[PDB]
């Protein structure tokens, strides 16, 4: 007598299927990864500063050195626990300081350099040698003109490297080209004090290194995230650490811009949301947002972590709502160069016309 009992709740059922699993998955069983004990933080800091102030032919392992600093900041055993909890069986290996050889430092002791697993020692030697040659040339040019903030041993140089990494992290749901362009463009502005202190850090090459690292070693993404979590929970910090956390929050809803833009289209009061074709889909739209509420604060990191569970948050089965949301975003001028597909062109056009009309006019409530 009434169509009240017709209901499926399929998305909640799919989430309950995926979430309530009694069996964990084992991956990377035979593999190993490198960490550095926290007691070597100073020694890693220098290295994180020597990739910064010289022009290097090869920037392959810069992201690895940033991860090594993250390991020193969190702790080798705690990093092993993090990588285990991410769902990986990677066997942590510990960084070892080794004497270079007959070469001696200013203090009269053997020059101790880091030995990181998976990083050829020749790469570390060439980075250190190029950095030493560059500083020798700079002191030949000018005497006593190098303050602490322009030296590799500055405590924030690992944070500068990790801020380039976080810039490439914000664009991990995009492609490599768009991510690299965005990282360079935004690093010219955001990391401007660092670029003044270190006028020859190759941001494109460091960003490509970080993109690579985030491609092969997915578990390191988790490690990266933990660093942000561990860094925003600290009572104090440096300016560079605040910058890192700011970019890390800017990475939050990555891979889910249609949800944010749909919230915008609701806040924009686009009348085409009331079109019957969209009205037939607001129920599943509401189910998607209910799923976001059910997942909670970890739902924003689903695409950054590359969770298989991501894709339950997709609004791709509501083509008319997606078209209206994209049209509202386009009318307001915030769509930019977003490449999401618009299934319904007519709804897109009508929504864009209404949003442009709304933005042009001004009203007082």
């Amino acid at each position: 007598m009434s169509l009240q009992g017709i209901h499926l709740s399929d998305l909640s059922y799919k989430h309950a299927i995926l979430k309530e699993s009694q069996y964990t998955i084992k991956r990377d069983v035979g593999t190993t990864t490198a960490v550095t004990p926290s007691s070597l933080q100073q020694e890693i800091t220098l290295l994180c500063g020597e990739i910064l102030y010289a022009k290097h032919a090869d920037y392959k392992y810069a992201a690895e050195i940033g991860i090594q600093y993250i390991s020193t900041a969190l702790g080798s055993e705690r990093v092993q626990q993090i990588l285990r909890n991410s769902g990986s069986e990677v066997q942590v290996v510990l960084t070892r300081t080794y004497s270079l050889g007959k070469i001696k430092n200013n203090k009269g002791e053997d020059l101790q350099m880091l030995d990181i697993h998976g990083v050829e020692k020749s790469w570390v030697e060439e980075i250190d040698k190029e950095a030493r040659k560059t500083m020798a040339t700079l002191l030949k040019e000018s005497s006593g003109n190098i303050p602490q903030n322009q030296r590799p041993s500055a405590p924030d140089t690992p944070i500068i490297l990790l801020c380039v990494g976080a810039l490439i992290f914000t664009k991990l749901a995009s492609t490599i080209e768009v991510g690299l362009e965005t990282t360079v463009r935004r690093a010219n502005r955001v990391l401007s004090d660092a670029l003044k202190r270190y006028p020859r850090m190759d941001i494109p090459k460091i960003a490509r290194s970080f993109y690579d690292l985030f491609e092969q070693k997915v578990y390191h993404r988790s490690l990266f995230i933990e660093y942000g979590k561990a860094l925003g929970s600290s009572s104090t910090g440096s300016k560079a650490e605040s910058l890192f956390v700011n970019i890390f929050m800017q990475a939050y809803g990555a891979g889910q811009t249609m949800l944010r833009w749909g919230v915008i289209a609701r806040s924009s009061n686009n009348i085409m949301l009331g079109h019957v074709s969209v009205q037939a889909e607001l129920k599943q739209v509401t189910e998607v947002y209910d799923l976001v509420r059910e997942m909670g604060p970890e739902s924003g990191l689903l695409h950054l972590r590359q969770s298989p569970k991501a894709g339950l948050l997709s609004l791709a089965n509501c083509p008319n709502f997606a078209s209206v949301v994209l049209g509202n975003a386009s009318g307001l001028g915030i769509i930019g160069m977003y490449r999401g597909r618009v299934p319904n062109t007519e709804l897109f056009s009508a929504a864009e016309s209404y949003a442009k009309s709304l933005k042009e006019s001004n009203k007082i409530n």
């Binding site: 001696k104 500083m135 020798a136």
Partner: peptide, 7 residues
């Protein structure tokens, strides 16, 4: 004289 720089 390259390996005794202060850094």
């Amino acid at each position: 004289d390259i390996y005794q720089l202060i850094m």
